[PDB]
Structures are given as structure tokens and as C-alpha cells.
Amino acid sequence: EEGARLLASKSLLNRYAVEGRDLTLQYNIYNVGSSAALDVELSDDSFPPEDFGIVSGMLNVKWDRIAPASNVSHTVVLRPLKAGYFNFTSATITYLAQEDGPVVIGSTSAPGQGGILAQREFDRRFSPHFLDWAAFGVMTLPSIGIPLLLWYSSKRKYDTPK
Amino acid sequence: KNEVADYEATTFSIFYNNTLFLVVVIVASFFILKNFNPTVNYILSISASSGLIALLSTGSK
Amino acid sequence: PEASPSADTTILFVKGEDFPANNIVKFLVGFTNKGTEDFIVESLDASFRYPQDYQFYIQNFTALPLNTVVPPQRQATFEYSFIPAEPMGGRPFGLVINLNYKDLNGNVFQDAVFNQTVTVIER
Amino acid sequence: VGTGTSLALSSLLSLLLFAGMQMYSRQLASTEWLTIQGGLLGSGLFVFSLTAFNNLENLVFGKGFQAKIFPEILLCLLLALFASGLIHRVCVTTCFIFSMVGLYYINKISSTLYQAA
Amino acid sequence: EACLEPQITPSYYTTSDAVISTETVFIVEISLTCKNRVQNMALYADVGGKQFPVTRGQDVGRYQVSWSLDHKSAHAGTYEVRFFDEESYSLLRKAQRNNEDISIIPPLFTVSVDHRGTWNGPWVSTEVLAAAIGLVIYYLAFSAKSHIQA
Known part of the structure; x- marks a missing residue:
């Protein structure tokens, strides 16, 4: 078959879906066919508004034409409002092969099941993920900064030039 | 004279000893032990830094 | 189990056919239902197999449970990811992906979507 | 300063220079000017290493031990040259040249401080 | 039909939390109203010389474009988006394939997306640098000791 062919993918760009925080959903479509997939439409009805808050993006979208050997990226940002097991199913895409x-x-790829935590846990696995060294300085401030600065005030007082 | 010597020695000494211990683990763990399991790295780094630092304490004396 | 004649499968790597060591590699497996019956995709596995001995198993990657229904004429794509071990860098391995699916009649099918020798380069 | 503290200080300065040179070896060799900058660093490593070696000799064998051209001076120069080769071959000429220039003045300094006293 | 005199009200979402998000994602939503009352037209966007088609919404006039770059390349600053219609985008492709001045083609409309920096902490979190600060502090401390011991 030489018609158009679309390989869609739905994946999360968040390690952890944190309650009340933004969750990223990326829908990437790849056209592996020789001809362009005309009149492509993506629909995603698997996110009821009663569990997620759409911070940005539209779940239902369209595309006039996807050139062969070309990929089109669409992203929607939601907000998981409830911690728990939330099943992410497969979105439906319709396209013309010719x-x-x-x-x-x-149907796009389905990430399946995941776990939404609570804000405090988010802090205790990775809050200073790249702040780690800076936090280390704050932890070591009592061990190094305070003694050094305090002593310097003493030395300045008695170390008078003669 | 006793007070100042007792104090300035305490504050500065703690600073230096803390400096060596924290610096040593950073260099040893992240450069010397770059090719070992974290578990062996923790045991070796912590044991080595503290032990060596104690030995340097007597060597100064 | 041999692949059904009415099922087609297209694989596409997200970032190309480079297999950097210690890095996540993601691919997308397509599915076509050219048959007048409903195909049920069970799971998609991945594994490293010896080059000289494709039967020998070196590393078995976990089996992804998909459990997705493909209606007639409709295409289902399924994604999978892994990470090749650091020591495998600089050596070749036989990467065998097998797609499992059964019709309603209980016929088993296991299409060798990709059966080739790939090389994992050290980064 | 105290001889025991002095030996440690010289060793620390030499060690730090050597570690930095290896870490940035690729950058240093990229350009001719950077390689010349390596020459300055290598000579400094030689000067500190020589100071440490004499300090160690004094402590083990007693104060006032005299450093000879061989093997104390030669060994310190050799170690600095070996580090120079690792970054690039080109420095071995420049890295060596800076070390020699420092050595002549250092001997002049030592003679005034010790022989006069 | 080309959108004569487009009127837009651009709104853009940009990542701020690097702790959770694996990669920076820029999202732009434009509610475009055409003077000629056109609807469901092909729109294509060009950002930093990269072509990304514009996704439409079922709602008439709602057009969106998003793209993602790593946190090591999401350097803070302003990013410009240039939009084209089907006709102009055809000329954009030819110009690139012919290596002509892309700027000659006047974009139908442009949108500014501000990125104020994904939060990675202050830029001291480098393993080599951590040793650099440790060793730099240590050398001064040790010299201070030798200053006291003498």
C-alpha cells in the first residue's frame, strides 16, 4: 500500500503527575506513508473536565495536510486535580490516506496507569534536583560559613597593626 | 588570654576540619570513586575521609 | 506463531536508528487490520539476542501489556522504550521485536516486525 | 613559616595546579595561546614541587639539608615535564622554558636569603 | 483563502518548573479573526528557521502551535513566531530550498513568546565546580592555618 500512514504517540513529559501542578501531554504524529495524510483530525475525550483542569491546549484539533515523511507535534497542558490512579487511554485520529x-x-499509544502524588511528597523526592549543590551550601553554612565569619570578626579585633 | 585562645582555636578549627571533610568526600566520591557502586562509594569515602583527617590531626601535633 | 497475512506492521524510531549506550530509545510499532475480524494486540516484547545465536537470550526487556482492540480497517500504534546497558556499548546485538495479537477465533500471531543486527555505540 | 606547615602548603599548591591542568587539558591544547598559558602553569607546578621536596628533605634528615642538581632538582623538573606532555607536545618546549627562567631567579633568591645569613 | 488583515489576541504558556517537566514546552494559542470571514485555513509557523504546522481547533478561528526544547537549550529570553498562510508558506519552502533571504516573505502576523527561565536553581550545580569551590575554600583555610601555626 502506498497510501498515507500515520503513527501517533501520546506520552507524558512529567516524571510525576503532581496534584494541582501542570501536567504535560505531547501528541506527536509521524507520516510514514509516501503520500500526505489529508484532513487529519485528532480527538481526545479520555480526560473528563472533572478530574483535570486544562491550563493550556485543546484536546480536539485538526490538520489540513501532513506531508509524507513529516511529523507534527501538538501539546496540551492539564492539571491533575486528584491524586490517584488515572487511566490514560488512546486518543482517536482520523486521516485520509489518498x-x-x-x-x-x-488510535494513539496509551501510557496506561500512573500515580499522582501530593505536594509534600513532591518536595521529598526532587525539590532541589539541580539546586542540590546550592542547598548543600546552605546546609554547610553552619559548618563553614558561620565559624569562618565569626572568627574573622575576632581576628580583625585583636590583629591590630603595630 | 586563655579565653581568646580557647575560642579562636575552637571556631577556626571546626571550620577547617569541616572544610577538609566535606571537600574530600566531594573530590573522592565524584572523581576517585566514579567507577564504583554508590554503596561501596559511601562506605569507602566516609571511612577514608574521616580516618585520614584524624591521622592528619595527630601529624600536625 | 506466525504473523497473520491480513496484519501489517510499521516500526519507526523516534530519534533514528542510533542506539546510544545508557540512553532511552523509543520506537513506535504500527498495526493494520486488513482482515474482516477484530484483532486483539496482547503485548510487545524486546530483547537482545546473540548475533551468532539468535536463539540465545542475552537481555530480556520487560513485556509491555497493551490489551488494545483494533477494529477492522483501523490502525493501532503502540510505543515502547528501554535503556541499553553501558557495557553493551561498542558491540553488536541482535534486537528482536515481536508483536503479539490474537483474533476472536483464538488464532495466535507473533509478527517479527524487526529482526536485524543493530549496533549500540558508546557515547 | 613553620617547616612542617610549609611542606604541606607547597604540596597543596602543586597538587591543585596538576589537577586543574588535566581537567582542562583539551581546552588548553586547542589554541597556541592556551598552550602557552599551560607553560606558565607547568613552571609554577615545578616551583612548588621543588619547594615541597626540599621541605620534606629537611624534616626527615634534619634542618638545613641542601638540594642538589641531581636527583632533587632533576626529579622535580621531570615530573612537571611529564604533565606538560599529557596536554600537548608543544608545551614541552614552552613549559620547560618557563621552569628554567624561574629556576635561575629562585637560586638567586636562595643564595641571598641563606648564604648571606 | 489567505487571511486579509488578521486580528489576533496571542496567549502563550511557557514552562517554569524544570523539577517535574523533562523538557521545556512552548505553547501558543491565537484566536484569529479574518476580515474576509475565512475559516478553517491552513496556517504554518516558522520559529528560528524551523517549520512547524499550526494545529486548528474544532472551534472556528482557534489556532495553536507548540514545540519543545531541552532545559540546557531553553535559554531565557524572547522567542519570535512568524505565521504564514498556505500561499506564503509555499514560497517559504522554496526560498529555503534555494537559500534565499527568508525575511523577504512578509509573515502574515508575528507573536512574541516570553520565556523567563526554567528553574534549575542557581548555576553552581556542576560536579566539577562543586570541587572547585570546595578546593578554593580549602586552600584559603589551609593557608590561614599555616598563618596561625607560624
């Missing part, structure tokens, strides 16, 4: 061709209905 001009005046039949609609090929497909």
Missing part, C-alpha cells in the same frame, strides 16, 4: 480516499480511523 485524495478521495476512505477515512482510516486509528
Whole structure:
């Protein structure tokens, strides 16, 4: 078959879905066919508004034409409002393989099940992930900064030039 | 004279000893032990830095 | 189990056919239902196999449970990821991906979507 | 300063220079000017190493031990040259040249301080 | 139909939390109203010389474009987005493939996205540098000791 072919993917760009924080969802479509996939539409109805808050992005979108050997990236930001097991299912995408061709209905990859934590836990696994060395300085301030600065005030007092 | 010597020695000594111990683990663990399991790295680094630092204490005397 | 004639499969690596050591590599496996019956994709596995002995198992990557229904004429793509071990860098391995799916009639199918010798380069 | 503290200080300065040179070896060799900068660092390593070696000799064998051209001076120069080769071959000429220039003045300094006293 | 005199109200979401997010994602949403009352038109965006098609929404006039770069390349600053219609985008592709001045093609409209820096902490968290500060402090401390012992 030389018609168009679309390999879609739905994945999370967050290690942990934190309650009340932004969660990123990236929908990447790849056109591996020889011809362009005309009239592509992506729909995602698997996120009820009663568990997630759409900070940005639209779940349902369209595309006039996806050139062969080209990929189109769409991203939507939500907000997990409830900690717990939230099943991320497969979104539906419809595209034309050929001009005046039949609609090929497909399903994107499904990440499946994940775990939403609570704010305090988020702090205790990775808050200073790249702040780690700076935090280390703050922890070591009593061990190094305070004694050094305090002594310097003493030395300045008695170390008078003669 | 006793007070000042007792104090300035305490504050500065703690600073220097803390400096050596924290610096040693950083260099040893992240450069010397770059090719070892974290578990062996922790045991060797902590034991080595503290032990060597204690030996340097008597060598100064 | 041999692949059904009515099922087609297209693999595509997200970032190319480079397999850097100690790095995450992600690929997308396509599925076509050209048959008049519903195919149920069970799981997609990955593994490193000896070059001289494709039967020998070196590393078995966990089996992803997909459990997705593919209606007729509809295409289902499934993603999978792993990380090649550091010591495997600079050596070749036989990477065998197998896609499992069963019709409603209980017929088993295991398509060798990709069966080739790939090389993992040290980064 | 005290001889025991002096030996440690010279060793620390030499050790720090050597570690830095290896860490930035690729950058230093990239350009001719950077390689010349390596020459200054190598000579400094030689000067500190020589000071440490004499200090150690004094403590073990008693104060006032005299450093000879061989093997005390030669060994310190050799160690500095070996580090120079690792970054690049080119420094071995420049790295060596700076060490020699420092050595002549250092001997002049030592003669005034010790022989006069 | 090319959108004559486009009117937009751009809004953009930009990542701020690097702790959770693996990669920076820039999102731009524009509610475009055409003077000619056009609807469901092909729109394509060009950012830093990279072409990304613009995704439409089921709602008429709602167009969006997003793209993602790492946290080591998401340097803080302003990023400009240039939009084109189907006709202009056809000329954009030709110009690039012919290595002509891309700026000659006047974009239908432009949108500024501000990125105020994903939070990685202050830039001291480098393993080599951690040793550099440790050793630099240590050398001064040790010299201070030799200053006292003498």
C-alpha cells in the first residue's frame, strides 16, 4: 500500500503527575506513508473536565495536510486535580490516506496507569534536583560559613597593626 | 588570654576540619570513586575521609 | 506463531536508528487490520539476542501489556522504550521485536516486525 | 613559616595546579595561546614541587639539608615535564622554558636569603 | 483563502518548573479573526528557521502551535513566531530550498513568546565546580592555618 500512514504517540513529559501542578501531554504524529495524510483530525475525550483542569491546549484539533515523511507535534497542558490512579487511554485520529480516499480511523499509544502524588511528597523526592549543590551550601553554612565569619570578626579585633 | 585562645582555636578549627571533610568526600566520591557502586562509594569515602583527617590531626601535633 | 497475512506492521524510531549506550530509545510499532475480524494486540516484547545465536537470550526487556482492540480497517500504534546497558556499548546485538495479537477465533500471531543486527555505540 | 606547615602548603599548591591542568587539558591544547598559558602553569607546578621536596628533605634528615642538581632538582623538573606532555607536545618546549627562567631567579633568591645569613 | 488583515489576541504558556517537566514546552494559542470571514485555513509557523504546522481547533478561528526544547537549550529570553498562510508558506519552502533571504516573505502576523527561565536553581550545580569551590575554600583555610601555626 502506498497510501498515507500515520503513527501517533501520546506520552507524558512529567516524571510525576503532581496534584494541582501542570501536567504535560505531547501528541506527536509521524507520516510514514509516501503520500500526505489529508484532513487529519485528532480527538481526545479520555480526560473528563472533572478530574483535570486544562491550563493550556485543546484536546480536539485538526490538520489540513501532513506531508509524507513529516511529523507534527501538538501539546496540551492539564492539571491533575486528584491524586490517584488515572487511566490514560488512546486518543482517536482520523486521516485520509489518498485524495478521495476512505477515512482510516486509528488510535494513539496509551501510557496506561500512573500515580499522582501530593505536594509534600513532591518536595521529598526532587525539590532541589539541580539546586542540590546550592542547598548543600546552605546546609554547610553552619559548618563553614558561620565559624569562618565569626572568627574573622575576632581576628580583625585583636590583629591590630603595630 | 586563655579565653581568646580557647575560642579562636575552637571556631577556626571546626571550620577547617569541616572544610577538609566535606571537600574530600566531594573530590573522592565524584572523581576517585566514579567507577564504583554508590554503596561501596559511601562506605569507602566516609571511612577514608574521616580516618585520614584524624591521622592528619595527630601529624600536625 | 506466525504473523497473520491480513496484519501489517510499521516500526519507526523516534530519534533514528542510533542506539546510544545508557540512553532511552523509543520506537513506535504500527498495526493494520486488513482482515474482516477484530484483532486483539496482547503485548510487545524486546530483547537482545546473540548475533551468532539468535536463539540465545542475552537481555530480556520487560513485556509491555497493551490489551488494545483494533477494529477492522483501523490502525493501532503502540510505543515502547528501554535503556541499553553501558557495557553493551561498542558491540553488536541482535534486537528482536515481536508483536503479539490474537483474533476472536483464538488464532495466535507473533509478527517479527524487526529482526536485524543493530549496533549500540558508546557515547 | 613553620617547616612542617610549609611542606604541606607547597604540596597543596602543586597538587591543585596538576589537577586543574588535566581537567582542562583539551581546552588548553586547542589554541597556541592556551598552550602557552599551560607553560606558565607547568613552571609554577615545578616551583612548588621543588619547594615541597626540599621541605620534606629537611624534616626527615634534619634542618638545613641542601638540594642538589641531581636527583632533587632533576626529579622535580621531570615530573612537571611529564604533565606538560599529557596536554600537548608543544608545551614541552614552552613549559620547560618557563621552569628554567624561574629556576635561575629562585637560586638567586636562595643564595641571598641563606648564604648571606 | 489567505487571511486579509488578521486580528489576533496571542496567549502563550511557557514552562517554569524544570523539577517535574523533562523538557521545556512552548505553547501558543491565537484566536484569529479574518476580515474576509475565512475559516478553517491552513496556517504554518516558522520559529528560528524551523517549520512547524499550526494545529486548528474544532472551534472556528482557534489556532495553536507548540514545540519543545531541552532545559540546557531553553535559554531565557524572547522567542519570535512568524505565521504564514498556505500561499506564503509555499514560497517559504522554496526560498529555503534555494537559500534565499527568508525575511523577504512578509509573515502574515508575528507573536512574541516570553520565556523567563526554567528553574534549575542557581548555576553552581556542576560536579566539577562543586570541587572547585570546595578546593578554593580549602586552600584559603589551609593557608590561614599555616598563618596561625607560624
